[model samples]
Target: SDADFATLEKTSGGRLGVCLWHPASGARYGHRMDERFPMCSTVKFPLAAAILHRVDAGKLSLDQRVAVRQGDIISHSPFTERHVGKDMTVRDLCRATLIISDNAAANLLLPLIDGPAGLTAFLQAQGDRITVSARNEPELNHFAPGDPRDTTSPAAMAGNLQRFLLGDVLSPASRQQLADWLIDNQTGDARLRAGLPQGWRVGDKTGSNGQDTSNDIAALWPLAGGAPWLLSCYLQGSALDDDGRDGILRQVGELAGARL
Candidate 1:
């Protein structure tokens, strides 16, 4: 049992890091929790949170229309690429990025908050010192293992979810909206959810950008009285594949959930 992760790393041919926490009790488990891992698509989660921060501040409206230019489209944009050169409500962009991990949709939304630095500032203002944002889509996803270009520690991100989603950074309505968006997330089928026990409920965001990178941030719920536990898991190969990395992440989820 002590070496379970040793076997996980050997089998997956990758390194793994995780931070699992239950907010109500302030209980946590850590394995390389302070280490950096590329943010990958997990960036969308906080970016979406940043958008909602603006909306909560009354600076933007969910129904407000934002124009999407044809040039803004980027790969992995299932929702945005389809609507190029069109208009979508702020709510639609948030949903597109969070639900579908839409690249173009994230790009469009980034500017509204003044790009990645704005998101970075937002995180800092929220008191997260370990998460950094320095690039836009596509580029943000391309990082060498341990490169630290755009990354967040599992502990940092887990604390982030705790603060923003379950705390006062967002209005209660926007807080509920972000979690609901992630619950409907189309990209999280395998990682956290796969590891969940039957009937166990969770809302999560998953990130993958090849070169053996796969990550997840989850809200594991109903710790009965201590509902909405948070977990952040990041994986990358010494040499692994999509199948291998995600499989490893699923195992990490399974392992972490046991303590939930």
Candidate 2:
């Protein structure tokens, strides 16, 4: 099985970073797990955590509603597609950000935590040196100047996820809520979700740059009451299209589900 995993790694034909960590046992399997890779919308995972941290600190309320002004909507965002010009609670906005990867909702959320600077600081304080919050979704999507483009190491992402699952980052209720949202994620079914074993549950975040990068990171919970594991895979230097990139991730997920 390890040989099979090595073969799959060779076949990917792209720079790859993977970390299959079973926190319960401290067992890890991967390649280049410390290398930096573009996080894409996976950055939303940390962003959501930041919001919940504030909620835990009594700095913000999940029930607080924010107005969605006409200029606030990002082009092609699902949030605008369905709820434009209406108000949404912080909790709902966080849901839209993670569940559907709503760009508009994410942008609106940036300022609530004092924008990119604040997010960067929050992550840095937590010992994530390479992950940086650079810009809103619109700027990132358009490749606008000054957007450093969010990036993170596979290990860092995996570590943050481990902390999240262990309830070391957010309060109990907040952690559970975030975990539920990830399980309900409606985007990128072709990635990690496609490779899971039947009846298994994965709470995860998926990210893609439409060309050069694709990623999926999740907590894999086996059948009821079994110890959960973490899987973080990030791809870069990809010449393949979106579907092709996702296929690579899918294969890795399959191996993880079956053997890890």
Candidate 3:
């Protein structure tokens, strides 16, 4: 069915894989994309979803405050500079988690609600088994790999985003709130945002490791020149040299955005 894709894969030097889906048509495509790898910061997506789900289930409150203290520090994040014992809420943590991909905020948020095991349990609830891990001891002891590399399948991520967009992941009002927060996330020179035409609405997330070998993009965008429709694209395992890596990302963004 995807004869062209095989040709494209060869041209890509077997270093490419993709997952694009039409929300309206329920049509999707991919090749060896099921090859799971560290999700890096993209892991925050599902964790946020789980948190909101907990809120909808009356297990947590978005506005409820948590005492930020010395103990809460589990990883280095811009938020680490703030004074400890300060009052921060679940919503505030979510803001930090999404906007800056703040690791500390995510680390704190995950455990406070569902304990260390809550992550895997939540993933299983979603019918995914990509093996998401956190940095906290309880999380690491159980999930191991102190690094933040929550793995996931494109189909699973698409399903998660569908739930996110539909508010099925949380209360109707909360979904809007979360979506708005996601729109504010800023990182990378240009990836998902680059994939859209000028002024197009795009809510997305980008992940990168300090090693500079891996990068990822995920977003929901409405297609142009036609009926209202949506598309999602994800890429991983990019190990291009520093400049090459960044260039490849921008190039892919252009291709994915229909700019090229």
| lDDT, candidates in the order shown | 0.83, 0.81, 0.59
lDDT of 2 by residue, 142-244 (tens): 3322444567788888888877766477899999998899899887589988987776788989877776778898988876777788889887766777888
Clash pairs of candidate 1?
A: none
Write model 1 residue lDDT over 92-202, tens digit each, in one string: 999998888888888889988989899999999999988889899889987675577789998899988898788999999999999889889887787778876655568
The best candidate in terms of lDDT: 1
- In model 2, how large is the Cα lDDT of residue 7? 74
What's the TM for model 3? 0.78
- Quote each prediction's TM-score: 0.94, 0.91, 0.78
Window of ten residues with lowest summed lDDT in model 3: 137-146
lDDT for residue 140 in candidate 2, whole number 0-100: 48
**Which is better, 2 or 3, measured by TM-score?**
2
> Quick one: best TM-score, which candidate?
1
Error of 2 at 182 (Å): 0.3
lDDT score for residue 41 of model 1: 87
Q: Give the TM-score of candidate 1.
A: 0.94
Best to worst by lDDT, what's the order? 1, 2, 3
TM-score order, best first, reads: 1, 2, 3
